[PDB]
């Protein structure tokens, strides 16, 4: 559960991504694939070589989805229903993997936006990503 402060911290921090959406999203994925090889088994049909075009494009989709989630922070189950169908119903992704990508997203943000990554903001971002993770791994329809 996010506090009013968590919501404003996330909006301010993620709002700095801007035109770096695809770059950061792609990097977060690359960090996950390299650091936790098992996550690669969910993308067997993907070209996972470093810097692959497919990963770059997908990184963009993930980043933009997060931007949408930030915009609908007060009604994520509703706004993310489609992604839940994909990750929970079709892909059946194990929740541990969401923890791994969430961690890699925090690492990416810390490496690119040091001034934004304060302890309180870090806390809010972790709660936010955990929230998104719960919606994507829950079958609520």
């Amino acid at each position: 559960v996010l506090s009013p402060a968590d919501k404003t911290n996330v909006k301010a921090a993620w709002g700095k991504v801007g035109a770096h959406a695809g770059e950061y999203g792609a990097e977060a994925l690359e960090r996950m694939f390299l650091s936790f090889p098992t996550t690669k088994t969910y993308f067997p049909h993907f070209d996972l070589s470093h810097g692959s075009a497919q990963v770059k494009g997908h990184g963009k989709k993930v980043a933009d989805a997060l931007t949408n989630a930030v915009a609908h922070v007060d009604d994520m189950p509703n706004a993310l229903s489609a992604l839940s169908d994909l990750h929970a119903h079709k892909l059946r992704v194990d929740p541990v993997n969401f923890k791994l990508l969430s961690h890699c997203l925090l690492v990416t943000l810390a490496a690119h936006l040091p001034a934004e990554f304060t302890p309180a903001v870090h806390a809010s971002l972790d709660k936010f990503l955990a929230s998104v993770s719960t919606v994507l791994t829950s079958k609520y329809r």
Binding site: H103, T108, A111
Partner: protein
């Protein structure tokens, strides 16, 4: 933990530049801020009521320095982490009863702090190597549980 010679060199090069006076305290500090329940293990550390209080707490910085020191020793004995942390594991598991999941959390927080300090120098390949290390350290710390 198995690190390629290339990974070993990259890990060592980065670790040698780490600010030993602050990195450990910032990692422990963020752990206490991001995962508030961990504060219950540090009742004697004084003021931990707010993020700023936690991060600036002299006792948090001092203890974080010991934590970093433990990681530094692990890096020097990657071939024998169980033995290097035997004593620490007995303390954290048998006495403090710290839940294993928390060892993993601190390890990843340390990774976030390294990313924060080194920025672009903390590349995905560098992180991957460090994840092997923190996982290895985390495992060793919880071995007395097995």
């Amino acid at each position: 933990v198995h690190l390629t010679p290339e990974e070993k060199s990259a890990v060592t090069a980065l670790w040698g530049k780490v600010n030993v006076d602050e990195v450990g305290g910032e990692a422990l500090g963020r752990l206490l801020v991001v995962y508030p329940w961990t504060q219950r293990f540090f009742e004697s550390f004084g003021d931990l009521s707010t993020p700023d209080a936690v991060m600036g707490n002299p006792k948090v910085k001092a203890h974080g320095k010991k934590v970093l020191g433990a990681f530094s020793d692990g890096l020097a004995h990657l071939d024998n982490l169980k033995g290097t942390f035997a004593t620490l594991s007995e303390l954290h598991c048998d006495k403090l009863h710290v839940d294993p999941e928390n060892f993993r959390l601190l390890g990843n927080v340390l990774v976030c702090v390294l990313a924060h300090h080194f920025g672009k120098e903390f590349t995905p390949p560098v992180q991957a190597a460090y994840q092997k290390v923190v996982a290895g350290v985390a495992n060793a710390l919880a071995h007395k549980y097995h």
